[PDB]
Design a binder for this molecule. Sequence first.
Ligand SMILES: [Zn+2]
Lengths: 39, 57, 49, 64, 59, 172
Amino acid sequence: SLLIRDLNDDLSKLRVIFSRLMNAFVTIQNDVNAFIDST
Amino acid sequence: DGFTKIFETALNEKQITNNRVKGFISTYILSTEVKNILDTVFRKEQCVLQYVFHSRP
Amino acid sequence: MDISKPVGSEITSVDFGILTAKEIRNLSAKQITNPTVLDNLGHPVSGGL
Amino acid sequence: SVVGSLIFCLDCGDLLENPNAVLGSNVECSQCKAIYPKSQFSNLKVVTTTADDAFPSSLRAKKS
Amino acid sequence: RPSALRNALGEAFGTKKAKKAIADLERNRIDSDKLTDSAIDIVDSVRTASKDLPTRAQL
Amino acid sequence: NKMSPYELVQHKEESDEIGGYFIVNGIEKLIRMLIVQRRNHPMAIIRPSFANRGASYSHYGIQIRSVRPDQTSQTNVLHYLNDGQVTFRFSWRKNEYLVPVVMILKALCHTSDREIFDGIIGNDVKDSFLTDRLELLLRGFKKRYPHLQNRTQVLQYLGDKFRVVFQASPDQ
Ligand SMILES: [Zn+2]
C-alpha cells in the first residue's frame, strides 16, 4: 500500500513511472486476496 | 482471470457498425473502473434489488 | 458457569452484513498504517500493529 | 528395392516418400540426386488382418 | 540474453503449456506511450489525496 | 574397520557393535532403504494416466530407469501416441521434455538407409502389423524437415532449443 500510496506525489506535484502503479495494482489486488484466500 | 483484475477484450468490425450508425442518438479494467459502474446499477435499479437480496420483509 | 451468577437475557438469532465505509467511523480507536509492528528496544510502537 | 507397400533404392540405399503425394513418374531420393526409380514404381499390394481378439461374445467363448 | 524466455515453449510439457496461457493473456500490452496512456495518469492519481502519509511524524 | 571386538570394549562399545548408522547432534539416526524398479530392463507399464497428459496418448508404455556408472539415475520412458507416432519423455529440474524419436534415433552414427528399417525384424517381413505401423511414424518425421539427412544436420535442431536449457557456453 505505502509503496503505491506515495506515487501521487510523483504525478500531481508536477514514461515508466506510470508502471509503478498499474503493474503494482496487480499486487494491490494480490494484497487483500492472499490475506483471505491464497489459491 | 480468477479473482485478480478482470480485464477487457476487443470487438470485431460487426460491433462498430453499431456505433457509427448510432450517432444521431485488449486492455485492463482496473479496480477504479468498476466503481463508477456500480454507482448507477445499484441505485438506479434499486427497486428490483430492495428485496432480492433479502429473505424477509 | 456457576449457580451463584445468574444472567438476565439470552440470544435469539443472527444477522449478516457487508463492510461499508460508513461503519468505519465508530468501529475502532486508532488507525493502523505503519508497516512494521515493533522496532528494536522492546516497545510496541504506538499507532502500530 | 521394395518392402510392404513402399520402395527403397540401391544408389542412395534408402526410400522415398509417398509417390502420389509428390509427382508420379518423377521421383528420386529425398537427399541425393541418385534417381534410381525409372518410373516402374511398384504393385502396391498389402494385406492386413484384424485377428479377432477384442470382439467379445458368448459365441467366441465356445471356440476357446 | 533475456529475450529467449520465449524459447521455453516448443517441445514442452502438455498441461502447463496452457498454464502460461494465463500469464500471456493477463500480463500487459506495450506499457508506455499507448497514445492514451500519457493523459490518463492524471485521472487515477487525482482521485486520492494521499500525497504524504509517512511513518515520519510520530511513534 | 578391523577392530577386534575385545578392543571395542576398550573403546566404550558393544561386544558386537553392528555399524551402519549415524549419530548427529546427540542421538542416533539411520538412512533408510528404499524401493525402486529395475536397473536396465524394459518394463511395460499399463495405466491410463499415461494418456492423461497429452491429447489422449494411450495406456501403453515401456520404460528404462537407466543408471549412470556412478549410480545417479534418470528416466527414459516411451509413450504410445495413438496417432501412429511414438514420443520420448525425459526428466529434469521439475520439467518434462518429450520429443519425437527418429530425430534422436538417427542422430548417433550414419544410418540413413535400410538399416533404419532392417533393425526391425529382417527375416520376418511377412507380419502385417509391421509395415502399416512403422511407416506412419517414419512419415511422422519427414513431415517436419525433409532437408535433414546426416547426423551433422540432425543434431543442428538441438542448437535452437538445447543451448540454454543445459546451461552451455556462448562460444560452443
Ligand atoms: Zn539417392
